[PDB]
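Example 3.
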Amino acid sequence: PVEVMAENARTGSRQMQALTPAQRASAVNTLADLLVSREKFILDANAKDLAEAQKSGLAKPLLSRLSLNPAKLKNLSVGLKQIAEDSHKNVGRVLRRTRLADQLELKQVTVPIGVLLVIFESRPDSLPQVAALAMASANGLLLKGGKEAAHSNKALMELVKEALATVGAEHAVSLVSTREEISDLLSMENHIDLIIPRGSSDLVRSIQQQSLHIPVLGHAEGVCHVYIDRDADLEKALRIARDAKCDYPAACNAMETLLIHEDLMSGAIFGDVCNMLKREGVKIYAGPRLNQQLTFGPPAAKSLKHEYGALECCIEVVPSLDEAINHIHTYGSSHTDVIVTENDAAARQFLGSVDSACVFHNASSRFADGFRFGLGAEVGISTARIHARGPVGVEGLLTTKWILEGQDHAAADFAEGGGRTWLHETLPLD
Amino acid sequence: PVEVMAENARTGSRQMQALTPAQRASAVNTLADLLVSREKFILDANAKDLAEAQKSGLAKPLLSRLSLNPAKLKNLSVGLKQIAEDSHKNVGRVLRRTRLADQLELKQVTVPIGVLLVIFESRPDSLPQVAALAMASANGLLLKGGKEAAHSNKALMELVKEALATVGAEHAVSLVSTREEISDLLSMENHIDLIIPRGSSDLVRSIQQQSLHIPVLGHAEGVCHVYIDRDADLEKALRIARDAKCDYPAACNAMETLLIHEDLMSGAIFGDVCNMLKREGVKIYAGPRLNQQLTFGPPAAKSLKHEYGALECCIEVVPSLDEAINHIHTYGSSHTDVIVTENDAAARQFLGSVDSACVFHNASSRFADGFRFGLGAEVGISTARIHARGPVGVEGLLTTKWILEGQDHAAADFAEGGGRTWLHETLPLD
Ligand SMILES: N[C@H](CCC(=O)OP(=O)(O)O)C(=O)O
Ligand SMILES: N[C@H](CCC(=O)OP(=O)(O)O)C(=O)O
């Protein structure tokens, strides 16, 4: 069934709630061990299921992401080991230690979010990742993929279920797929808490539109942007654009535009970068100001708010750093940004100005992946205006809960009628 | 108009964004000064407008909350002074200082939320509160009340507008009311960010239903709950129920139920508490188990998930502490809770168990107001599953923004093809 799953999930969440000390670390340890001890099973499952899917040939991005080999298995094992190691005290943590009057102290402890419902096109290299995520943040977890690789996902589900049942006393994790009517449970409320799409632009778009009245994660479209300044040496910009566009054209956080100080048009930079893009075979559009400054020009642009995911990168140019700010905040989804120059003043004003999901200074918008931030294995990428930004580390799955241990106190007793006063002494947090 | 207001708001937000050092503190200082220097104006405005509204006589809760006197003005002045004092460094704060490789350091700075849209029935003792809130968290602000007290609210708007224009160089705060079609702008997106209802149960309910796809605040219905244990001396429970129900029956966070160890039914506690409730004239319903244990009994109960706001408090009893947990998590909106006993073991298990918006140990659910937490003047009360819980302090209006200042780095350069490595040295945060 469906709802009984969610309730089993909540129950088990509270079950494993009181089991932090070396428990869940040991749990994901044994999970890694099981991952490295039942490989032939899961390897052959993935192989046969993907092979059976090949006869259909539904789409090359999927039919590529579906891959899985012992290398990826070693990678997942080591990543989950890292999560185990650094996941010591992400629950049951204090954040403030404050007193009000005699024997009147409070704090602000951490606590799970509840019953998450992750949705992704079958990239079965993800399932154990998020499973360890849940079992480290102790918040029980549902899962829901697509018909593709369903058998392999089922095998991984057996994996994680056994691994949890080792110690944990409850299967506080479940899979529900095979025609489960995304709109049906998506419409349901008061059981699921955080919808974490991961698959690709299709899922996140279809959700953000479809979804209504539910806390979600995941951005809309990774419309990056870049800037270069009159005080930037060129070869920087060159290799930067290389890392930016040349590397992984289908990446969510992959750059999709560019912007340059108009004055340095007279620096041959344009020719260098565009000849380089052609050396790497990159389709080129541009914008109105570029249509102005030159005669022949690359083709027109459909809409500045587009996305390509392949070797295509629009290009505009403006005179004002502030005009740059206007443009970034007007068109792009403000998922990312970057500045390249040597002056700090313009740089620091910029960094202090834009409200993207991050900024950089002589870096590569390919940097935003969490793993590159030493942030522990991320769970997604958020661009929403609340509760999480950019790389959503494991901390992006926790909330607060105030506790108070008084003796005999009350509200009216603190008024002038009683001998109760406020102190607000911020104790050293334990 | 409407949208131009929102855009003026965003512009001014970024305007005052780069003006932290003693600027906004001075701004709210001068705001308090103006509040204490143009009283006759605003006092007479409130007086005349409320008097004109009295002829209608729309509702006593409103026609009571509408009050305003020099005492309340002194109170607002001192509260905003407190906000000024403690609002030094809530923006431009670092949270982590981490390096990856040579000259590759990052951080995680704070940043406003954007363009908030607060909605409340006209309690004009609120407007300057939230205005100082915005101007301390630098996030520009809209405002939208009801037709009542519109003139007084307009006067306060003149107040705050002049106070901001003193220094701030932009009116990054605006009012839009007088028939502004809540559903119209509520439906609008991509300009407003956080909807903060404050008025009363009516507004929050009508919104939560009406609202769709927008980050909101404010709970649904402050269905509290209480527990008492077989290891609690009675007079505690007595004065606790006093402070709980007797004080402010219409309070959002006011208790609405009760629960007692069934064994101590044999302790005359029931008679004491109910005779006390009658001494304070409290309407009484109860629940099925109580219907069982006694014969005559108070009347039936419509639905356990109800709310009264007046001298009415349902009462149930269960044997199992865990059954208590089940009940709290099943019926109540889990806005609050409290335990009263002397054993820590049961107490500590409880506190570690329930997932309300807070818990207590020998306190009064009237405690949850933020001001009682030394938390600075709150802005609302959230019960949502994300981003804020219980007392939403001023910190509940801030987000994150990652910055990076590298030299010439890239993503592929960190692979084995380059001499780039990861360090993850958590520097001492500045
Ligand atoms: N393949 C990813 C890097 C590519 C990336 O941008 O992140 P992803 O969108 O695949 O989660 C990794 O292993 O860190
Ligand atoms: N009147 C409030 C206390 C009552 C209360 O529960 O808070 P409120 O719902 O009025 O914001 C105060 O001044 O702190």
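Chain B has 14 helices and eleven strands. The first strand of chain B starts at residue 97 and ends at 101.
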